[PDB]
Write a protein that binds this ligand. Structure first.
Ligand code: EGJ
Ligand code: EGJ
Lengths: 253, 253
């Protein structure tokens, strides 16, 4: 794989880490997206190890609701990621356009997200927080997790370590349950549940789990969102509980 | 401060990070220990930031049961730490020499440790795991914590973070309560409570908190050790509870 194998189109975002472009593989004429990351930028920020781990994880993820990584390559200064192109843009842009989503559209997206996350959980892969600007849309309107936000000793010290230092990240697998609650609310309401005018007030609202619903949010949607937005991570439902929630099964396409 | 200000004596340990030596300040003839760390070694291991934070914390710690950092200095390639010299060596060496400690010696050391840790807790400083080889002894037999094992955002992301990602390290302040339990047991018994022939068996014993006491360990010592060695960090006592435990108040000098 080399840069010359691709015809480049319009930019699809610019950042300090990498630029993304629409591209076409020259031989096949297959449309895709090419992300170019600069090695020195990744090294200077101490994110190069984190990137390699996320790319290795992402290589084995094949799901309709996860943005596909077709392959990758590099040269002396840059790493190139060959990605699926999602033609309908972000869920964030769609929410801006529509103001808020109806219950069918929302339950469908939540199902797609929980399916992707359940598929990853079965491979012992968990995801961190999820933002709607990192959720892309395919030609048939399928949502695509596109952030790559995945995660999978000193001598003579084991004897002295407590269980929490050796058992690993205990309930880090529950961060994405809280993200589904925030997204389900944001999709129905048009804004995230803890949004406030200042950092301190936003922090207070999340830490105390202080949120209310507009009157139009229905009983089923409130029940699901209230179960997802638990302060204690272990009390948040399993993804299989989300997929079988009656508001989800009634409204999801 | 410069190297020429000190007369160097015998080595007090050698490692890939730094060498320690007995030293005497030339003008005052005051005995101390000088630790020399190589900047390139610290940088290559990605421990240089961690070191600066621990040294900054350690600069403000003045307690008879914490090894004193008198000051520090550097040149082009190395960082020098000017430390208190503890003439009676480690608690680890004393335990080897005596086989095990009596209840008075043990309760006294536990008190000294809990006092140091309580003093740090009041300054919002917590400690990680504690090993007896990092516990030194002063001329009057006072134990000295000497490991420096102390500890004190993306745009548009706060709205999407769960409480556990913003509230910080929740109960990391409880690791050192588990260390006091392991040390109290090791001091009375002569070996740590979860010691086993293999890594897998040691891991199993800590994770399941599977330990027993030799018949000679008394009721009071069992009560304290059993309260410290709780799997759930939040259920371990506060340091003030350790200091007021009747086995401690009865046996501590
Ligand atoms: C900064 C924005 C630019 C972006 C451009 C854009 N992309 C597509 N489809 C793609 N399929 C693959 C990659 S982009 C379709 C578009 C349709 C109309 C308008 C802009 C479009 C947008 O404005 O929606 C995409 C989202 N982020 C970047 C970004 C964020 C996370 C991950 C990735 Cl990989 C990423 F690129
Ligand atoms: C590898 C061993 C070597 C050591 C040497 C030694 N030190 C002292 N007293 C000191 N007061 C200040 C620093 S050393 C007294 C001794 C008495 C007899 C025999 C050896 C002695 C030992 O064998 O006990 C000390 C413990 N660790 C090193 C070590 C570990 C953690 C922190 C530090 Cl700073 C450190 F140096």
């Amino acid at each position: 794989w080399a840069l010359e194998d691709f015809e480049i189109g319009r930019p699809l975002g610019k950042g300090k880490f990498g630029n993304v472009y629409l591209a076409r593989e020259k031989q096949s004429k297959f449309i895709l997206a090419l992300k170019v990351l600069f090695k020195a930028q990744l090294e200077k920020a101490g994110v190069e190890h984190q990137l390699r781990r996320e790319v290795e994880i992402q290589s084995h993820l094949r799901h309709p609701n996860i943005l596909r990584l077709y392959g990758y390559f590099h040269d002396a200064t840059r790493v190139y990621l060959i990605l699926e192109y999602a033609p309908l843009g972000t869920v964030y842009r769609e929410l801006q356009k529509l103001s808020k989503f109806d219950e069918q559209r929302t339950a469908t997206y939540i199902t797609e997200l929980a399916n992707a996350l359940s598929y990853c959980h079965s491979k012992r892969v968990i995801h961190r927080d999820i933002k709607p600007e990192n959720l892309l849309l395919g030609s048939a309107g399928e949502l695509k997790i596109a952030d790559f936000g995945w995660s999978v000793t000193l001598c003579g010290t084991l004897d002295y370590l407590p269980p929490e230092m050796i058992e690993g990240r205990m309930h880090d697998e529950k961060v994405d349950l809280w993200s589904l609650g925030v997204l389900c609310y944001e999709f129905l309401v048009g804004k995230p549940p803890f949004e406030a005018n200042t950092y301190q007030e936003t922090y207070k609202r999340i830490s105390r789990v202080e949120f209310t619903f507009p009157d139009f949010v229905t009983e089923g949607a409130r029940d699901l969102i209230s179960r997802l937005l638990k302060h204690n991570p272990s009390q948040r439902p399993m993804l299989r509980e989300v997929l079988e929630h009656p508001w989800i099964t009634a409204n999801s396409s």
